[model samples]
Target: DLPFPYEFRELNPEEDKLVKANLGAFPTTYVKLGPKGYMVYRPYLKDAANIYNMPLRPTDVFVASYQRSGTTMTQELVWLIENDLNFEAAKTYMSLRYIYLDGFMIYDPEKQEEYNDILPNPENLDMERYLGLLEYSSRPGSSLLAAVPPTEKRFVKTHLPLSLMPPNMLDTVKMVYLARDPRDVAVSSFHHARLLYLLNKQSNFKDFWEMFHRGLYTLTPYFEHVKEAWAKRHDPNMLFLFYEDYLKDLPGSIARIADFLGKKLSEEQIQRLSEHLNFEKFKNNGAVNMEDYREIGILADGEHFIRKGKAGCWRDYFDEEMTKQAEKWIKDNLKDTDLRYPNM
Candidate 1:
């Protein structure tokens, strides 16, 4: 039901083999969509149709970005600011507090086998409680779907490029779009894809880099996603932030988000929240870190949801050629435009 109808090109034989080896029976018939034809799973198209007409209110808030661009950190900050910094309410798991608009699309109902392997120990899983939480997040053959239009203020998260979002989304609600240098994002994404069971657990970074270089990722063609949001940086309802900026000055960054959300935090509260959000502490914060994903086996073995959140850690992962390729890719894509990340 997408505006363009759900169309997908099968992964080439090699891409197919890689996907099968890495992610058995997962949705591997990959193709591209939108104006630039960036990668997205075929099942995602079914939900893509719903996004355009999703009921949104002026009171609703959104945090939009290409994935792994500090979305979890920003969500915690934005939600606390919008809701008067209720530390008790903030203790709730984030995927429950805010809607991951496409969380439902991760499943493939056609493949019943996916359900069997989703849990590391099905015998230990308390089915009733697990199903309760599953409705709010990405789970095989299930996700939260409201039967009626949302009537209350909402907090939403998305990695979809703005171009594919509802045309009225920006005018109707306040949105914060966060951008990170692609080099660093590349490292985070390689790990993230595996963590979510979307990529081969044994695959090397080189495999991820190869796909990234080809612009093969959900909601990708990276420049298109970043550039579209950059043009709207000064819009009344749009708040544009960068990964490096917040990394260097989280206090100011928190202030910026509070101001944009029309909330006031005492300087005392800012200090408290800043300490709570520091990467080291955030990693251990159970509500913020969904390490339960690892315990249940949705996350790959030996991987955690939150990894290193440093700005330039791509240095450790990228070899000379990979570094050279990342640089040229960024330069070539961003050359014709004035878009660039601040030197961090």
Candidate 2:
């Protein structure tokens, strides 16, 4: 069992009752709390910090993604390769239970609000409840900081942007980095954000684009998050894969990931892993992916976290001017030739 290691804040009167009623309930999905708008369980700050920078070994493999950028796919691919494409284990067990998603801890979230001055609307502020979950779960005896079982290889998942990630993770372990164009990311993220709140309830294209430009929504600036991983494109221990590229050629992506981990899958194993990675196949698997999370209420009700598996969805939403602005932002900020848009 993992040991938790941190302190959570107390629930305020308004949020106290709801927390007690749902003490056993999972944290709300889609709408995580943040300063400006709600977000994922960011109240688990020290967990993020501790695990983000936690040391790694050859026995450890880390999956890093910027929110929706094919993270699940990357995790599956790595899990398969780690087990030498063990289909028996793959089918019998799911990724979350098998690989272990660490970092379920807490810190003072209300103080966090006052720290950031984001406590404007107290009515909906679940900071205390969120904090309570974190506090109770973050103790040294908690399940988060437990060491990996000696016999099994360890693979974990995280979404913290590099700027916020722990230093040891960069300097120490083998990190599998996955990303998608921020344009498509924005479209998907907009819907994802709306699942928590009516972010762009009033307008569609215009307001959404404005929010991105102003950096009003999203926990991390969309572009900054993508670029952080991109900057590490040259790290020897770091392997970068694009979602678009994976969608186009999954087998190739899997092969590359295997190479990074120093594992070679047999032809038949590659075929099976590729088949398992299919969007439809994953959607059907109850325990392996987001399906269970949504059903268990870790995510919003009936919300398709995996809404559309297609890349380049942003083109459908971004108009000419919006697209140009995105392009200009990319050109101005993205320096690595490796990160430029692909020839479509």
Candidate 3:
């Protein structure tokens, strides 16, 4: 007999070997939710089934994306626009204002120190309310949202695929799924993992790249995650954004996002918002950066979580040999679908 809907499993021996060889046995696994698989770890997976029943509201706005696929940038842009371009309010810690629906993808508690880059000389980012909320997500839900009050307006962040989210929440609430070139996403994620100390001593960019290319990375099988959202692009409540497009013309991107949210921005508002949201400026702004999480122990003090924010930084990491592998993987994945990254 077939497995139950949304059943979960660990990687097969060979894939698990790759994981151990590289990241050294992180507590992650896979779950097939309809058309594709998702990588989940920690209490989040146990909470997954319950997350489906999460309450939806008319004012809820979602910014969902695979990790490092321009999610933070998009979330900041969406939050500011929805807040009527209130720069003052934007200074508050991002997660304080926006609900990280999946919570931060943190390392296993016992293994945290080894993954960090620095010694005790220079080192080390909490979620009590959210844990109670995660508990509430299953226990009849909405008290999770109810705690915030209806007039507050929710700007929620999630990386979960459409199949796992609250039943057709997209049909009811607005969402923007930010997409990026897998090569760029891979490179960005490599650095992000190191900063978050998610990688282990044995880990390196090449091994991480393999996990990515094989569709073995967390919340991946990239095409499926992206296409699922793209397929629903026509739904009145959904907006599909591309990272490459945002880098090339952020003001235009902002205009589209503003229109989608049914918000009006005068030329001055758009210009000011664009200036703040500009990738260069955004990477350092402590609030938008979420770097404060470092003390609570989410990020290690190395390279910042927000990297170059460019499209093709993958070239710096991928040599001639690795580049060919990426090309082949890209070609193979692109087959039989109109899906295409701008650079491709």
Candidate 4:
């Protein structure tokens, strides 16, 4: 049960249609495809559109969360545990293999064709290039472009929220979800949405803020999204973590995560992973952070992806009225639930 029931129900038919139609109006970079929905994209690669639907290994774990609420942080943690806290391998080889299932490097061949057909392609070629063509860089980073070769264990990351995830992931693959305060997520997301617009095309911050306020961006209404994931606590494979908790007690959280992933780290390695997660080290380290994305125009350099890196920052922006509204919104939707709210 969500703390606010029905506050984050999966989109209804009308809402889904409207959202898809609205997003479809945007440029090629804003393409979308549902679990079993119609395909739409250009420079299409037909085979890869439905990759997430495939059967997953029990050793595989999926890191799912709303945007900015510690998705990367959760990923690094999972990488650490899934590798038995081997920081060197995690920092080097594994980070290179991690993938954000729906972000940056995503493309489906058939869907690409559908999207391309909807646009004005002056290039009259019978077939457009593969989805990889849009990307100018072949350099490796934490993207689907960087494949995770089959091994004893595999991990995948996503910002698709609970509703958009592959059903099998929920049922089979171990899932680690990290959530943060919505107000801060909203404030942080303002710039993030703007960057998305700028990198993919361009949009004024005010316009992007409006969409954010309306919960139009990917993985939105931060609290509600988190609530959905948190509701799965009874599921053996699902583990919910809070970003604030990490900030408050890194070692405790790391210990819990290691236990969840069935890892036993050496004293030194535990210290190393926890320290690597520190703001100072993370900012300076390029091996596991989004610094490269800055140069590639995916993110604004020095914009502080780990800004504040604290919990309860939402309180700073949520006025009494806003807080009341948020409270009511949550209560109205999540009534009759036993969901526990982790204190900020």
**lDDT minimum window of 10 residues, candidate 4:** 1-10
lDDT of 3 by residue, 199-270 (tens): 675678998999887877777777778878888888889998899998788889999999999999888888
Ranking by TM-score: 1, 3, 2, 4
Give per-residue lDDT, candidate 2, residue 311: 76
Give one digit per residue, the lDDT tens place, for model 2 in 70-174. 877777778778876666676654533333343332234344343212222334435555445445444521143246665767776766565444554656668
- The lDDT per prediction is 0.74, 0.59, 0.73, 0.57
Which regions of candidate 1 fall more than 4 Å away from where they truly are?
1-28, 115-151
Q: Per-residue lDDT of 31-126 in model 1, one digit per residue for the tens? A: 667557766766676766667556567787889998888899999999888878887989988977877776555654565345545445556655
Residue 63, model 1: Cα distance from true site in angstroms: 0.8
Please give, for residues 1-344, the per-residue lDDT of candidate 4 as tens digits.
11211112345565455445444443433223343222223222232334433446667788876777787777888886776666667656334456555544333333444534433342443332323344422221233423555654666766755654345466667888877656566667755544433222243334444444445455444455666787787687888887778878888888888878778877777788788888877756677655544443434434655565666666666667677766665566458776545662
| Candidate 1 global CA lDDT score | 0.74
* TM-scores, each model vs. reference: 0.88, 0.70, 0.86, 0.69
Candidate 1 lands at a TM-score of 0.88
Best by lDDT: 1
lDDT value, residue 275 of candidate 3: 85
Question: What is the overall TM-score of model 4 with all chains considered together?
Answer: 0.69
